[PDB]
Amino acid sequence: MKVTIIGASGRVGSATALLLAKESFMKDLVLIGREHSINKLKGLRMDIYDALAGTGSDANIYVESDENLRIIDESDVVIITSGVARKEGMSRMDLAKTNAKIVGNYAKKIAEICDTKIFVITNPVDVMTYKALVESGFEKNQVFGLGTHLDSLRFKVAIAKFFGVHIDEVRTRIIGEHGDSMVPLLSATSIGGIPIQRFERFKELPIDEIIEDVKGYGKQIIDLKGGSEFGPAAAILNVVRCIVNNEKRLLTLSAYVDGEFDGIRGVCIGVPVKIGKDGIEEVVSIELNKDEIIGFRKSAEIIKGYCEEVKNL
Amino acid sequence: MKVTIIGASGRVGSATALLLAKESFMKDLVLIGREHSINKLKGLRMDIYDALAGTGSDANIYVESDENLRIIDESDVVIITSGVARKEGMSRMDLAKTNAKIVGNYAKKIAEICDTKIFVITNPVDVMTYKALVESGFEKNQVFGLGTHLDSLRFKVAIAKFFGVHIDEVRTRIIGEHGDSMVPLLSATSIGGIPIQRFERFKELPIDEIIEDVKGYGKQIIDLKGGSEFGPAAAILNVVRCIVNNEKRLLTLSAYVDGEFDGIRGVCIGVPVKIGKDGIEEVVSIELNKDEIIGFRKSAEIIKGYCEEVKNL
Amino acid sequence: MKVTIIGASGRVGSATALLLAKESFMKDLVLIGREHSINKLKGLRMDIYDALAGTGSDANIYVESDENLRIIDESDVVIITSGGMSRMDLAKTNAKIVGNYAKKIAEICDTKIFVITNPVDVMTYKALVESGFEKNQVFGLGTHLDSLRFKVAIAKFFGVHIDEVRTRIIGEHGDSMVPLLSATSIGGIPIQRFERFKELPIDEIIEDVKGYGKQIIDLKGGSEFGPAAAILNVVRCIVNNEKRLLTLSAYVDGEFDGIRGVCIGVPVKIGKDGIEEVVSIELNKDEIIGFRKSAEIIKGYC
Amino acid sequence: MKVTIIGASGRVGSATALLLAKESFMKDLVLIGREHSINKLKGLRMDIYDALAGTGSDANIYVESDENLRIIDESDVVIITSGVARKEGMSRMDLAKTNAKIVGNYAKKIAEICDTKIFVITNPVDVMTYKALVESGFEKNQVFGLGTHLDSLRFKVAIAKFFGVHIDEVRTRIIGEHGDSMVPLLSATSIGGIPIQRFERFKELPIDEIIEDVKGYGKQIIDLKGGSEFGPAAAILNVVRCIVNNEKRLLTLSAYVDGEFDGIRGVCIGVPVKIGKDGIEEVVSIELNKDEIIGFRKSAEIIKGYCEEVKNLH
Ligand SMILES: NC(=O)C1=CN([C@@H]2O[C@H](COP(=O)(O)OP(=O)(O)OC[C@H]3O[C@@H](n4cnc5c(N)ncnc54)[C@H](OP(=O)(O)O)[C@@H]3O)[C@@H](O)[C@H]2O)C=CC1
Ligand SMILES: NC(=O)C1=CN([C@@H]2O[C@H](COP(=O)(O)OP(=O)(O)OC[C@H]3O[C@@H](n4cnc5c(N)ncnc54)[C@H](OP(=O)(O)O)[C@@H]3O)[C@@H](O)[C@H]2O)C=CC1
Numbered sequence A, B: 001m002k003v004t005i006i007g008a009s010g011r012v013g014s015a016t017a018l019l020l021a022k023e024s025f026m027k028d029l030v031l032i033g034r035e036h037s038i039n040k041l042k043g044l045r046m047d048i049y050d051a052l053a054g055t056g057s058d059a060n061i062y063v064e065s066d067e068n069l070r071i072i073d074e075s076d077v078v079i080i081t082s083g084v085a086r087k088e089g090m091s092r093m094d095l096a097k098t099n100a101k102i103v104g105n106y107a108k109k110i111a112e113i114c115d116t117k118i119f120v121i122t123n124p125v126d127v128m129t130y131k132a133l134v135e136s137g138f139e140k141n142q143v144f145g146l147g148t149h150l151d152s153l154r155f156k157v158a159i160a161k162f163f164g165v166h167i168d169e170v171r172t173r174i175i176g177e178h179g180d181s182m183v184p185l186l187s188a189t190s191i192g193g194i195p196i197q198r199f200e201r202f203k204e205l206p207i208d209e210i211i212e213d214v215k216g217y218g219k220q221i222i223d224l225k226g227g228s229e230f231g232p233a234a235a236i237l238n239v240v241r242c243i244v245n246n247e248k249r250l251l252t253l254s255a256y257v258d259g260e261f262d263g264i265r266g267v268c269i270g271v272p273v274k275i276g277k278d279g280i281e282e283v284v285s286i287e288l289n290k291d292e293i294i295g296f297r298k299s300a301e302i303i304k305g306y307c308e309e310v311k312n313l
Numbered sequence C: 001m002k003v004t005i006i007g008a009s010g011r012v013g014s015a016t017a018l019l020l021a022k023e024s025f026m027k028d029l030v031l032i033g034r035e036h037s038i039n040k041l042k043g044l045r046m047d048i049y050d051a052l053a054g055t056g057s058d059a060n061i062y063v064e065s066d067e068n069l070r071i072i073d074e075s076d077v078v079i080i081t082s083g084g085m086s087r088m089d090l091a092k093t094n095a096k097i098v099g100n101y102a103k104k105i106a107e108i109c110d111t112k113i114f115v116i117t118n119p120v121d122v123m124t125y126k127a128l129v130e131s132g133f134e135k136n137q138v139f140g141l142g143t144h145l146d147s148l149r150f151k152v153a154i155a156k157f158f159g160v161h162i163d164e165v166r167t168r169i170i171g172e173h174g175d176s177m178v179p180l181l182s183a184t185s186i187g188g189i190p191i192q193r194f195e196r197f198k199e200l201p202i203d204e205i206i207e208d209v210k211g212y213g214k215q216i217i218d219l220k221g222g223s224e225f226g227p228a229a230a231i232l233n234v235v236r237c238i239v240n241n242e243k244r245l246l247t248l249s250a251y252v253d254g255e256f257d258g259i260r261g262v263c264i265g266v267p268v269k270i271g272k273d274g275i276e277e278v279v280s281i282e283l284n285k286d287e288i289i290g291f292r293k294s295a296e297i298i299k300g301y302c
Numbered sequence D: 001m002k003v004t005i006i007g008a009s010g011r012v013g014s015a016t017a018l019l020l021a022k023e024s025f026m027k028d029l030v031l032i033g034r035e036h037s038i039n040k041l042k043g044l045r046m047d048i049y050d051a052l053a054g055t056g057s058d059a060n061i062y063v064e065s066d067e068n069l070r071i072i073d074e075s076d077v078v079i080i081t082s083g084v085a086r087k088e089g090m091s092r093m094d095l096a097k098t099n100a101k102i103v104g105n106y107a108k109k110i111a112e113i114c115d116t117k118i119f120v121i122t123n124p125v126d127v128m129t130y131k132a133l134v135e136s137g138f139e140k141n142q143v144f145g146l147g148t149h150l151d152s153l154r155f156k157v158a159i160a161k162f163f164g165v166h167i168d169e170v171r172t173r174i175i176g177e178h179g180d181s182m183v184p185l186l187s188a189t190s191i192g193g194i195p196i197q198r199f200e201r202f203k204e205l206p207i208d209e210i211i212e213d214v215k216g217y218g219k220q221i222i223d224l225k226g227g228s229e230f231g232p233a234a235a236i237l238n239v240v241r242c243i244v245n246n247e248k249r250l251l252t253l254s255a256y257v258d259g260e261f262d263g264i265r266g267v268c269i270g271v272p273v274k275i276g277k278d279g280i281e282e283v284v285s286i287e288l289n290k291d292e293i294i295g296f297r298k299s300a301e302i303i304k305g306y307c308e309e310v311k312n313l314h
């Protein structure tokens, strides 16, 4: 597999490059960034190769500036982590538009070298995925973002740790925006295939506290460690692996939705999606509880209220 | 880890020995059998080691008679596959009575050498696990059987392949007898954490035909291939790996039930159970639908009908 | 990846189907065999699938008869296991089956042929001939398994992990096999740099290696797990383009002094294009003379 | 397995905590650091758990100050990463004497809680491993350091990439000091078990350039990326995996040598070693060329010079 990471110089990008290169399926990793970081990206490559000696793997790691994008040719997936972080004062809309410009330019330049999938990781992830689809011209099967996937996994760990089960034993889901308007789906939470509502502990579950903790999780990591890198990279690798082996898996990712749900249309939002070799091959239609569906509609409306201002910027 | 396979000369035993030795956690494998099989088991040892060189793994494989059982000392687990094969005219009770003597003798001898877990694979498995618990004297946590685990996995593959998803995406369960009175738990069937009852293809799911195919799958494999060996070994390795890495996972296995479900007491039957480092650390009590619970109760009545005849044989 | 096993109903074929389907890269496994075996292989497909639920893997396993071979199309590799007799008798009988199957493969698609049937060094030659493929496409297991058995021997004698040893046995998959003590390392450290090489019972170890297979036939009825694991190792090297220096049966066109025009076990660089190179190495005088004798025997049968 | 990473707040410590918790054999990971780092470690734990969800693994990660060390008890291994960073004007002896106090106090305190193995990573690695053995009081088997293991891995990738083979195909070694006096052992360089001296490119091998690049590789990553984190972590995980599964493997690591090589005695230096469940179970005696052995002796003399002045620095 050939995967190009635009923004490997970053925290999440560099961790992602490590986790991907050490995989057997990864054969040609392309580390891209702006010119001033090329030397940094040349150090990263070095470091990665050392790990590849201790893990017993090998790959062909490349390093280039954001001008020569023919290195991106024939790439199966291009992960875009490039973006400006949220400093003090920037409104949600301000960062939305700034990173919209960055990500849309990258998507346009990608679409002009080869026909590939674009895995958007930059925030606002829903709006950036929307701008990526617009500026790439690719199909909806090709453009997707990380969305609320990581929040779903962060909810999964908490449900498991409270229920005394392995993390992988719990399989929950949080659809909607990667933000405060997120909707946790207790209807699609099961532990061993057993709906969580079939256990006597679901009555003792502090769902309100767990959901509050999940909502503020990212800012907590930003404050304690300065930022999350290992978890985001692991989730990215999960999606990439589902693609490389065509594991037709029902994950939750940011996707363009065209009415597969009640009133949800013309928006890139976190949704249940069947991922495989051809990217998002389907937007799975699920039955939601009343509360879940009202919240989902409202969240998508907010996401569209932001998508509007970057569609032509 | 140390695991002793009593009956490694057999089909399932031999496949299990290979798939276990290949694992990193396996460090001492003991292949026990009757004396006339000692030449075969040694010939298996050789074969296994060749494969260990191709996978890059290594383990210390031993071969001994079923009269020298001190080699089993300090074993983490003892997997018992030894048993008579069902023949024409042999009723269910005939096999139960014949193999209860075999498994009870082996469990007795195991208890006299060391204090270990006994993983009974021999059939009728729900009844042989009971005989093993009785004659071993171990705690209810130490003795368990494969039960309906393989049936549940065979149900899983059908639900998944019919829903067009990766097998691992489906997580269904079948509790009850490892036989005709098995009750599949549609209440505990989910696909991606999403209860299958929330999908539109659930109404068009041929549930009755799929359960029919599951109930006859064993006879089918026996008529086409001569017996199942790989899949049973994979399920055995699954349980063994949950034990070794204390993966507190909610599986479906043959276990002694003492009132964790209404009307189900004093029997080894297929039930939901939390497996971890201490074997069966809990018999999880879950909400079953009315039809599922009535079926479970009838199934356990049948199982206890067989258990009473062999308890003192 | 798509891989087809001709003879999956057999021992090695069946175990190899299991070990291959289990892997993430295996996406399409085609099980081929004569018509009378179609029900056995079908049963195999069931058992495999159960194990695929126990390992958490998935694949698309197909079952077809050896008179409907269009399902071999687009295959990355086709492993051919189908196969008072003399050595020449078995060679002559299996040559017909191997050559016919290679022929029918060449008429379906341009793919790689992994010869497992014995005599391996001669059946690989016939596969290449009747296939019409390039020398890089057709290859055989050769002394790969013999080298691995010698590896476990060296390692278990020196008290180290099996993967810590890397020895080789080039030449015939038979009595004229030459073990390369010159190319035996333990941690990359030549075995001749240890105080134990003097105490190594090389004669006994090579005796056991030369009769290893026949003893497995007498004690277990045949080898299935080791052969399948070696086959999986080679298929793994191919799928990920791992340019790895393995010892396999290949056609040699003058890559060693005095040996040519034959498919024999040699040191080779395996990669995405099958055998991408016949590595040329320095052998001690004894090793090269023995390899020449082995080459002439193998060519005598060819 | 229980592993305690002292200095997990650092670069290598954090990467190592991730790579280790992610493995199936890791069941209880203890992340230790000074009090002011306790917040960062608490954040790191969060990151780790998120990764554990995406990898399908799970573990019990703990966080505690460097004053509450009773959590280290029962640890299978204690990786010591804590140390000062080399700075402008800090000489080799300066850093040796400074990190000696840190690692020595940590080794003492570890010995006061439990009898575990100590995996020293802090530099000067050979000297710090010697100080750790001295202050811990443990047997020579229990204390060991990363030494020239990563140097050997970097030499491995270079040899392999020049010979056109997979990295796992090459199995070279570099013994000696993790620094100036390292001796690459071309005697123990094999490619598929074939000594590199049996190939046609051994004559074409740019040995001088490759060894020089390896010798300055560390400062180059330090100047380009600010430090190495992933590769050191992977090597640490390699050694830890050998210890957990009793993989009796012949790795090159920093260990105390008592004459297994001619005259090489009374120092912790990079040596070929047989690692297993009991830590460093043996110092392998191999045949080295004349140049290799003389270089190893020079290296050992340098290491002894540094060990001498920090052996009693509390
Ligand atoms: N769940 C999710 O979807 C999550 C979202 N994210 C998002 O991903 C993005 C990356 O995060 P992280 O890697 O932690 O961030 P860093 O700030 O560490 O790195 C981001 C990279 O973006 C590039 N960059 C910065 N400014 C510009 C610019 N003005 N023009 C072009 N490229 C620029 C830089 O690389 P170079 O200098 O090479 O261009 C920089 O290293 C963030 O926006 C974050 O919000 C991350 C984690 C989770
Ligand atoms: N899902 C499940 O729960 C499954 C249950 N099973 C059951 O497990 C058992 C083993 O199956 P399989 O491995 O296919 O069977 P085999 O008959 O191939 O092997 C069982 C072994 O039992 C030993 N054995 C046979 N008779 C006796 C005896 N009278 N006294 C002592 N030992 C004896 C033999 O080994 P030796 O000659 O060395 O003693 C024989 O190899 C069967 O009863 C089968 O029904 C199997 C698969 C799935």
Ligand SMILES: NC(=O)C1=CN([C@@H]2O[C@H](COP(=O)(O)OP(=O)(O)OC[C@H]3O[C@@H](n4cnc5c(N)ncnc54)[C@H](OP(=O)(O)O)[C@@H]3O)[C@@H](O)[C@H]2O)C=CC1
Pocket: C006, C007, C008, C009, C010, C011, C012, C013, C032, C033, C034, C037, C081, C082, C083, C097, C116, C117, C118, C120, C141, C142, C145, C146, C173, C222, C223, C227
């Ligand atoms: N080191 C090596 O290279 C090794 C060599 N081998 C060789 O590979 C071959 C396969 O061994 P194994 O799988 O153990 O053998 P089995 O005899 O158990 O099965 C081989 C298969 O060959 C097929 N077959 C038999 N006769 C014919 C025929 N007349 N025409 C077509 N197909 C036929 C059958 O499958 P179907 O009925 O589906 O055709 C049968 O299952 C043997 O010759 C063995 O010597 C095996 C292991 C290691």
Ligand SMILES: NC(=O)C1=CN([C@@H]2O[C@H](COP(=O)(O)OP(=O)(O)OC[C@H]3O[C@@H](n4cnc5c(N)ncnc54)[C@H](OP(=O)(O)O)[C@@H]3O)[C@@H](O)[C@H]2O)C=CC1
Pocket: D007, D008, D009, D010, D011, D012, D013, D032, D033, D034, D037, D081, D082, D083, D084, D085, D102, D121, D122, D123, D125, D146, D147, D150, D151, D178, D227, D228, D232
């Ligand atoms: N091949 C090898 O053997 C290599 C050796 N190393 C060496 O190991 C060490 C780790 O390097 P890196 O991880 O990059 O280092 P960092 O400096 O990033 O982290 C080291 C940690 O040590 C702790 N620390 C710093 N000063 C003191 C002190 N005075 N007393 C106690 N603890 C202190 C800090 O954690 P807290 O504040 O929580 O105590 C700090 O995070 C370095 O000395 C490096 O040279 C690294 C890589 C390879």
Ligand SMILES: [K+]
Pocket: A021, A022, A023, A024, A025, A026, A027, A057, A058, A059
């Ligand atoms: K790779």
Ligand SMILES: [K+]
Pocket: B021, B022, B023, B024, B025, B026, B027, B057, B058, B059
């Ligand atoms: K093992």
Ligand SMILES: [K+]
Pocket: C021, C022, C023, C024, C025, C026, C027, C057, C058, C059
């Ligand atoms: K597969």
Ligand SMILES: [K+]
Pocket: D021, D022, D023, D024, D025, D026, D027, D057, D058, D059
């Ligand atoms: K773990």
